[PDB]
């Protein structure tokens, strides 16, 4: 079995958990202790020392977007994350760079800070959520006719939506029900219904992460 060494509150890791589970692969999960890095994670990636990495055939695949595409290409037989045409997977990648970059800095700061930034990213979060809202036109997913590449990227941001519901004190649904409820569709599937941890717990992670560093 390929083993996922991961971080239970990590969206990025959940992307990997979602990918493997979307497929149908039996894989082993590993809990990482960031203070006490395992010898296997250290030996897979002694540089950034970052999750998730999948060792399959005795070879480690690091970083979330990179893992999910490794998941797709190493097993490309049933439910494909990419479309068949170059410009199609293109859009999925373009929006994958979108989700992991500007959308992520917006949320990282929504759950991660107080004062000015938090408000400045109240705006940034809403406006980015707005542009995905625009781009989707009206797609039940993102990257293809079923569960896909950027759907994978952002679905794990949907566990954190309740954390962005409170510290951002938003309703990301009352301004744009389209996106959360895109996830709530995506939630009926077991890839996210078995890989995504409790949201009351995600709201807890960020709340306690707020206690420990000021």
């Amino acid at each position: 079995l390929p083993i996922l060494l991961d971080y239970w509150p990590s969206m990025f890791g959940m992307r990997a958990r979602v990918a493997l589970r979307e497929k149908g692969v039996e894989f082993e999960y590993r809990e990482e202790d960031f203070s006490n890095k395992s010898p296997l994670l250290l030996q897979s990636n002694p540089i950034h020392k970052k999750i998730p990495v999948l060792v399959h055939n005795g070879k480690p695949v690091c970083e979330s977007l990179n893992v999910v595409q490794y998941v797709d290409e190493a097993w490309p037989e049933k439910n494909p994350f990419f479309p068949s045409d170059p410009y199609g997977r293109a859009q999925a990648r373009f929006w994958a760079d979108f989700v992991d970059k500007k959308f992520t800095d917006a949320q990282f700061k929504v759950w991660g800070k107080k004062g000015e930034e938090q408000e400045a990213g109240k705006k940034e979060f809403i406006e980015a959520v707005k542009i995905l809202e625009s781009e989707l036109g009206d797609k039940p997913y993102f990257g293809g006719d079923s569960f896909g590449y950027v759907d994978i990227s952002l679905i794990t941001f949907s566990s954190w939506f309740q954390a962005y519901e409170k510290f951002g004190n938003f309703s990301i649904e009352s301004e744009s029900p389209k996106l959360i409820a895109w996830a709530k569709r995506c939630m009926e599937k077991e890839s996210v219904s078995k890989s995504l941890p409790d949201s009351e717990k995600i709201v807890a992670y960020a709340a306690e992460y707020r206690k420990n560093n000021l």
């Binding site: 045409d85 199609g88 036109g137 029900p177 895109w182 709530k184």
Partner: protein, 569 residues
């Protein structure tokens, strides 16, 4: 920013470019829609190089019944996207029925864009034929007073009510209309029949500035002006003393109207005198608005019999027919509005959808294949099929249109149509005769006040414990609650079957709820629908709402002039 010349020359290039932008419309819709679960089942994925040939060979034509279950999925708590995509801001209903049953269709903000431009471009085309003063107003019998929220906590939407209550509407339409006569709150007054009375009052309130008289439908104006005919001796008294009739009871609209009223005796002398110099209100509208350039609304199809009454109301002031489209998508625009109503044909605007036409050429019906927009044949009648931003992908909507000619490279369409009629076995009944009978039975309690029922509908709410039946009424005048309660009881009493009895007597279906809505609601259900882009075969009102009808659903909850549960039982 509205500007006559650049918008129409861009519309001219647009109609010259019918082919690409049709292609592009489809292209962007599917590019925006590569994830649709309908489409995986169709074998679609986008791009490639046979994209037009692909869909015409790969995705099958569909009906309202097959369209029911998936968007039902969106609406009912499973906040989940389907044949196009995302949990839309609003979902539809359709006149005629889905096997006797309700039909849902999604709304996204693109649909609003479809509208702004159409009104943007067409107002400019009318202003080309009837140039308006930039300081005037209009009497617009327009209504959006009402917005329900689905059982899943999702907005369920009407075409019109999603127009006016939208965040982009007021700023969006500032430049392409003469400023509204009504305060925002009376258009959106929870009592729209009183609002109607106030709207009468409203467009009348700047007569010399009024540039036209508007209702989406002639029957809308006809009924407005037959209701004009019903209540403006009450208005003179109302505006005379600076105190409004006892007919008006809802606080927010009463507050808004109280902000404008002061006593004024001379004009009553005035008002009685002009008005019957006519014999019987022929040309009532140029009499009312002597500076109005036109009457704007549908004058084709099943509204052709209301055109005379309106022209009777209108006299000789020129009558301009208004364009065709709906939530289900926009189809055709009048770019030459000066032409007479019987000859009225409207030109298609191409990026509001990608639509195909099933020929009637064989006998009736005939096994010919669908053909594209510019390859359609002049003089002949085709049935409209629609693919757009509204959740319809090559959908058979079911009505017939004739091609009269072309405005350059885009075709002119005429509508001798009326009803999308053929029906089949429903479940929101309670036999149609029984529900019509129910309305008829209880309504003569209101007829005691010299009232008749102009229309009615119904609905089943199964989020509540236990679920309850919701019946909706449009009546000719305001009355008290005690009699509306008695009516609700009678409506329960007029559903005569042994079945209905076991239910509600044993409360396994909760007490039926009569929420009497106000006037124009069913004017509004007609009004968005002959206007609907396809062909005037769009008139059979769905009469009770399975959790799969929506225009009326967004028309149910908020305009409760009253809402009550049977104190009997």
């Amino acid at each position: 920013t509205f500007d006559m010349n650049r918008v129409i020359d861009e519309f001219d290039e647009m109609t010259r470019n019918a082919h690409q932008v049709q292609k592009q419309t489809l292209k962007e819709i599917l590019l925006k829609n590569q994830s649709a679960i309908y489409l995986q089942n169709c074998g679609l994925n986008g791009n490639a190089t046979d994209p037009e040939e692909a869909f015409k060979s790969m995705v099958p034509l569909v009906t309202d019944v097959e369209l029911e279950p998936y968007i039902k999925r969106m609406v009912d708590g499973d906040t989940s996207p389907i044949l196009t995509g995302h949990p839309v801001p609003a979902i539809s209903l359709s006149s005629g029925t889905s096997q006797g049953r309700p039909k849902f269709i999604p709304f996204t903000d693109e649909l609003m864009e479809n509208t702004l431009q159409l009104f943007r471009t067409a107002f400019a085309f009318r202003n080309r034929d009837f140039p308006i003063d930039d300081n005037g107003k209009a009497l617009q019998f327009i209504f959006s007073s009402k917005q329900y929220i689905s059982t899943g906590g999702v907005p369920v939407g009407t075409a019109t009510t999603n127009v006016y209550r939208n965040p982009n509407f007021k700023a969006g339409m500032k430049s392409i209309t003469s400023p509204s006569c009504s305060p925002d709150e009376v258009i959106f007054s929870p009592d729209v029949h009183q609002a109607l009375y106030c709207h009468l009052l409203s467009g009348i309130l700047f007569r010399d500035q009024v540039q036209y008289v508007f209702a989406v439908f002639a029957h809308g104006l006809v009924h407005a002006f037959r209701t004009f005919e019903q209540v403006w001796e009450e208005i003179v008294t109302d505006i005379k003393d600076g105190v409004l009739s006892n007919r008006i009871t809802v606080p927010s609209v009463r507050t808004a109207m109280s902000k404008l009223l002061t006593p004024n005796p001379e004009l009553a002398e005035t008002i009685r005198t002009k008005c019957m110099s006519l014999s019987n209100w022929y040309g009532l509208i140029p009499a009312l608005f002597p500076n109005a350039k036109y009457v704007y609304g549908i004058m084709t199809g099943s509204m052709e019999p209301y055109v005379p009454k309106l022209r009777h109301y209108a006299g000789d002031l020129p009558l301009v027919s208004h364009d065709y489209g709906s939530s289900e998508g926009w189809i055709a625009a009048n770019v030459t509005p000066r032409l007479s109503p019987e000859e009225a044909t409207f030109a298609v605007i191409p990026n509001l959808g990608y639509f195909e036409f099933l020929p009637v050429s064989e006998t009736g019906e005939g096994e010919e294949k669908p053909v594209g927009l510019t390859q359609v044949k002049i003089g002949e009648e085709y049935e409209v099929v629609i693919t757009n931003y509204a959740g319809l992908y090559r959908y058979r909507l079911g009505d017939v249109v004739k091609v009269i000619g072309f405005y350059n490279n885009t075709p002119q369409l005429k509508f001798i149509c009326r009803r999308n009629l053929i029906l089949s076995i429903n479940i929101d009944k309670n036999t149609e005769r029984d529900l019509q009978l129910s309305v008829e039975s209880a309504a003569k309690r209101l007829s005691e006040e010299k009232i008749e029922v102009i229309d009615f509908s119904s609905y089943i709410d199964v989020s509540t414990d236990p679920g309850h039946y919701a019946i909706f009424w449009e009546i000719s005048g305001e009355t008290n609650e005690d009699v509306l309660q008695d009516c609700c009881n009678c409506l329960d009493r007029a559903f005569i079957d042994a079945g209905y009895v076991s239910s509600r007597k044993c409360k396994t279906i909760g007490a039926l709820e009569l929420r009497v809505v106000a006037k124009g609601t069913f004017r509004k259900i007609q009004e968005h629908f002959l206007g609907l882009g396809s062909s005037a075969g769009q008139f059979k009102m769905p009469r009770c709402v399975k959790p799969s009808n929506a225009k009326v659903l967004q028309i149910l909850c908020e305009n409760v002039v009253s809402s009550y549960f049977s104190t009997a039982f």
